[PDB]
């Protein structure tokens, strides 16, 4: 289909091919002091977050109908879904059988290289990679599901009906694609609790790093952090 | 001063339960969080609020500080005062937590409310116990946690003068009986444990099964350096 083709184009252009996988910082072993971190670790944590948000903004821009939402509805959807999309995309593209995290830049980093910046959270994101990989979700389904994570009801949308209409079109597009392959949706929804838990772990880690204030969080991440806290 | 050590010991012993008023009625020797675990966590924290205030006012010098500095020192030090008094009063050997009301509980009857933090608190307690810290040494230690430099003090010189009097009183007692610096060594380990408390309240405010009571919330909000 034309919506599916567009969703798949956007997904594939928002990450790296096997070709431009960047091993310039990958180390199979490092010997970290666990349960602590330095300014360098925290800056990279924040840079990987910033890089993913930049890339998720350009992917959302290429979903048909999204660019025509009000600027504020675009922002609200992007902030509300950022953390959930960062985890879901990082989980889908990573190699947990080799302890490999693959960020959207093409940067590859060992579990142990992420431990200082991310803490426990990255162990859990790798656990979810295995969980996700076991469901054998093809690229076109994932391309739809990531968009359904973004284009969803949120408190404070100016045009909630336009967002629901676009939700309808994308849900319909996915149904068509699982019909075309049939000639797993109950099971996928089974994972939504681990994923909500991983979003909470993310907020826990930003809170901790803000408490420690080795380096301040980037303005745009700090706003997502603050705007997400129901209090 | 002299009579200062004695004043500090009297404050400490009057702030805690007489070995008589110890209450085992709710103690279970064999046993995520729901609302009752969160309510209990907030109740256990809240029970120390008035007791730590009454203790502070009985520290010679403390009522001589500006009212704003008093409130600031109390608020800044609450979590650490809670952890250290609990650590000292509790029997980690047996996983027995003893609250300043006399309530006695096993770690597994609080673990769901406190999370991981209770194991850290109990780890700290075993370590505190190892030093065999005598009541007078502890009477000054706890005061040193309260009477310490904080951001936003009106009279930081005066707060620092009071601290030095209390450290002098401690050093003298500890000499009159590397030990000193292993007592003082517990103050910064207490700050690291403070942080886990803030992490736990942050998490509970996110989950929001029950809201923190306003005085805890205020202490939470006022102790975030951002
Ligand atoms: C691996 C499982 C993820 C697949 C996406 C399924 C939910 C998408 N839909 C339809 C939503 O309305 C939605 C629901 C949410 O709980 C949510 O946080 C959100 O951002 C959007």
UniProtKB/Swiss-Prot annotation, chain B:
Protein modification: Acetylated by p300/CBP, acetylation increases stability. Deacetylated by HDAC1.
Phenotype when changing residue 88 to A: Abolishes binding to activity regulator Cytosporone B
Tissue: Fetal muscle and adult liver, brain and thyroid.
Induction profile: Induced by cytosporone B (Csn-B); directly stimulates its own expression. Induced by corticotropin-releasing hormone (CRH). Induced by growth-stimulating agents.
Compartment(s) where it occurs, according to its Swiss-Prot or TrEMBL record: Nucleus; Cytoplasm, Cytosol; Mitochondrion
Annotated transmembrane regions: none
Domain remark from Swiss-Prot or TrEMBL: The NR LBD domain binds the lipid A moiety of lipopolysaccharide (LPS) in the cytosol.
Binding partners and assembly: Binds the NGFI-B response element (NBRE) as a monomer. Binds the Nur response element (NurRE), consisting of two inverse NBRE-related octanucleotide repeats separated by 6 base-pairs, as a dimer. Interacts (via N-terminus) with NLRP3 (via LRR repeat domain); the interaction is direct, requires binding of NR4A1/Nur77 to NBRE-containing dsDNA and lipopolysaccharide, and leads to non-canonical NLRP3 inflammasome activation. Interacts with GADD45GIP1. Interacts with STK11. Interacts with IFI27.
Physiological role: Orphan nuclear receptor. Binds the NGFI-B response element (NBRE) 5'-AAAGGTCA-3'. Binds 9-cis-retinoic acid outside of its ligand-binding (NR LBD) domain. Participates in energy homeostasis by sequestrating the kinase STK11 in the nucleus, thereby attenuating cytoplasmic AMPK activation. Regulates the inflammatory response in macrophages by regulating metabolic adaptations during inflammation, including repressing the transcription of genes involved in the citric acid cycle (TCA). Inhibits NF-kappa-B signaling by binding to low-affinity NF-kappa-B binding sites, such as at the IL2 promoter. In the cytosol, upon its detection of both bacterial lipopolysaccharide (LPS) and NBRE-containing mitochondrial DNA released by GSDMD pores during pyroptosis, it promotes non-canonical NLRP3 inflammasome activation by stimulating association of NLRP3 and NEK7.
Name the UniProt record assigns to this protein: Nuclear receptor subfamily 4immunitygroup A member 1
Record organism: Homo sapiens (Human)
Lineage of origin: Eukaryota, Metazoa, Chordata, Craniata, Vertebrata
């Amino acid at each position: 289909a034309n919506l599916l083709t567009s969703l798949v184009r956007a997904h594939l252009d928002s990450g790296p091919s096997t070709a431009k996988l960047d091993y310039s910082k990958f180390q199979e072993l490092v010997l970290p002091h666990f349960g602590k971190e330095d300014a360098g670790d925290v800056q990279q944590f924040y840079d990987l977050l910033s890089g993913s948000l930049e890339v998720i903004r350009k992917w959302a821009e290429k979903i048909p109908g999204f660019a025509e939402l009000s600027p504020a509805d675009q922002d609200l959807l992007l902030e509300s879904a950022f953390l959930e999309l960062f985890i879901l995309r990082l989980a889908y593209r990573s190699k947990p059988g080799e302890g490999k995290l693959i960020f959207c830049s093409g940067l590859v980093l060992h579990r142990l290289q992420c431990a200082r910046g991310f803490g426990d959270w990255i162990d859990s994101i790798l656990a979810f990679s295995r969980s996700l990989h076991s469901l054998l979700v093809d690229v076109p389904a994932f391309a739809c599901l990531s968009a359904l994570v973004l284009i969803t009801d949120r408190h404070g949308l100016q045009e909630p009906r336009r967002v629901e209409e676009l939700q309808n079109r994308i849900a319909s597009c996915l149904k068509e694609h699982v019909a075309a392959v049939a000639g797993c949706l109950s099971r996928l929804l089974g994972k939504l609790p681990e994923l909500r838990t991983l979003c909470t772990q993310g907020l826990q880690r930003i809170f901790y790093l803000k408490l420690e204030d080795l380096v301040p969080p980037p303005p745009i991440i700090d706003k997502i952090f603050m705007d997400t806290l129901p209090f």
